[PDB]
Design a protein around this nucleic acid. Sequence first.
DNA 1: CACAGTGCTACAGACTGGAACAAAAACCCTGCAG
DNA 2: CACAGTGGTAGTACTCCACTGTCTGGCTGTACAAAAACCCTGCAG
Lengths: 85, 285, 115
Amino acid sequence: MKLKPVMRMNGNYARRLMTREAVEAVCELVPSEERREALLKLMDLYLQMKPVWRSTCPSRDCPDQLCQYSYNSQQFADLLSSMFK
Amino acid sequence: GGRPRQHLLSLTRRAQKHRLRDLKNQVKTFAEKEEGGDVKSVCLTLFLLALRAGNEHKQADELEAMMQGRGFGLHPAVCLAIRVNTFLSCSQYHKMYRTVKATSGRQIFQPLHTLRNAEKELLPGFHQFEWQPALKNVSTSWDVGIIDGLSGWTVSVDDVPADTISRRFRYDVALVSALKDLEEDIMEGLRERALDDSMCTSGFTVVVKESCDGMGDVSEKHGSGPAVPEKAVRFSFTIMSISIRLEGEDDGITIFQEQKPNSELSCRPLCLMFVDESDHETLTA
Amino acid sequence: GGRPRQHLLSLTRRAQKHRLRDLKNQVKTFAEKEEGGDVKSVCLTLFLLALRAGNEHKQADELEAMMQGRGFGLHPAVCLAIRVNTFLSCSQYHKMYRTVKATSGRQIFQPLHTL
DNA sequence: CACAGTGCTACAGACTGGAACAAAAACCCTGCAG
DNA sequence: CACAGTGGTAGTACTCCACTGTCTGGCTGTACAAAAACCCTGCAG
C-alpha cells in the first residue's frame, strides 16, 4: 500500500487506508480465518456506504447505495456488536 | 466573364493556392543559381526595403528587429530567467503563457519545451573541459549530469541498508559549469584591468568557499520507498574570488570577487541528501 | 574570374538592389497583371508560404503581429488575473514587468499603479 | 466519491505537396417565358 | 557590521493628450566611378 505512519491522520492517508486492497495487506497479518473474513466483509460494507455521504449529490451519482444505506448500516452495526463487542 | 473577388487579407491562408504559383516557381528557379537552398534571405531583403520605399518608417523598427536580433518575441533565455528567478511553478508559468497567448496574442512568452531545450546549456555536463594533470581515481567523462549520490550502493539486503536517497553533481563538472558561467564577469574584470589577452592566459587562482549544513523537521512522502529519515542535508559551494599571478611578482591579482556572498543568489547546491546530522554512517557514505 | 561572392547578412542596400532588381520587377509585373499594383499587400503576403512550407509556429506569430492588432496593452484586468491566479508577489510581478519591458519592450504587462 | 497541481513523459494532435476533385459562391449569360 | 525582500504612499520626475510650421533624412528611375578581391595571364627567379 506504500503508506507511512502519521501523528495526526490526514484524510489522504484515510483514502488510501479505507480501500479494500488496503485491508488486504492487513488481512494477511491476522492469523484467525473467520476474523480475516469478518473485518474484510466490514470494510466492503464501509466502501458501500461511504460514497453516500462523500459524494456531492448521491440522488443521481449513486442511487442504489443510498436506497440500501439503512439496511447496509444495520448489517454493519450487527457485525460490530457481534464479533467486535 | 469571370468573377469579382474581395481582398486577400480577409480570405483564409488556404484561399491563396491560386495567387502565388508564379512567385513560388520564380523563387525556386532563382535559388539554384545564386544560393542553392537559402530560402530566408531572398524574401527578407526585397521586403523590408520594399516597404520603406513608400515610406513611413514605423514598420522598419518592427521588421529590422523581427529575426536575428533579438527575441521577437522574447529570447528564450530572458523567458527562462523570468521564470526561474521570480519563482514561477512550471505549471504556473504555462498557465500564464496560455493566458497571454489566447488573449491579445501575438503570444510573447516562449512555450515550455523550448525553455527546456534552452536549459541544457546552463546545467553542468555540457561544457567541455580537460584537467592537467588528469585527476586521480576519477572518470574522464565530462558529460555526466545529475547523478544519484548513492554512487553504486549494491542495495543487497545482507549489507548496510541503502535507505538514504541523494542526488549530486559530479564535483568537477559542477565546478567547470558554475565557473564558465562567470566567463562574462571574468572577461569584463580582465578588461577593467586593461590586462593582456593572448599572453598570461594560464596563471589563474580560484578560491571556492564550500559549506555544508543540516536541516531538520522535513516531512517525507509515502512513495515507493526506500524508507528514509526526515532530516535533510544540503551540501553547497560558492565561488568567492578569482585572481591572476603571471608574469610574476605582483602578489596575486584579484579579478572577480563576490560582492554579497551571504545572498541566496550566490550559493551553488551540490549534494542533496535525506540524512540526520547525528548518524555518521550514511553521512560519510 | 570574380571576387569571392557575398554571404548575405553583411550588407547595406544598394548591392541588394541588383541582387534582386529582376525579381522585384517580376513582382511589380505580377501585382500589375492580376492585382493592379498594390505592392505592400503583395509583399507582406509573400513570406508566409515560403516560410510555412516547412516551418515553425513562431512564424505565425511574428508575422501575425504586423500592422493590424494589437496589444498595445494587455487589458489591466487580464494582467491582474494572471497576477493573483499565478500567485505572483507584487515585487516579483514588478520584477517581471521591468524585465519584459526593458528587453524588446514594447512593454506588455500593465504597471502596478494601474492594477 | 476534495481538488489544483506535480515535471517529464507519452504521441495524440497541429503542419506540406501535388494531383484533382467536386461543391459552392456569386457573375455572366442564354434560354424560354408575361 | 547579512540579504532580498514587502505593499502603500508621497514624493519626484518624466513623458504624454490639441493647436503649427519647418527641418533633415531618406527613398525612386540611370548615370558614373572607385574601391574590392579574385583569377587570369604576363614577365621574371
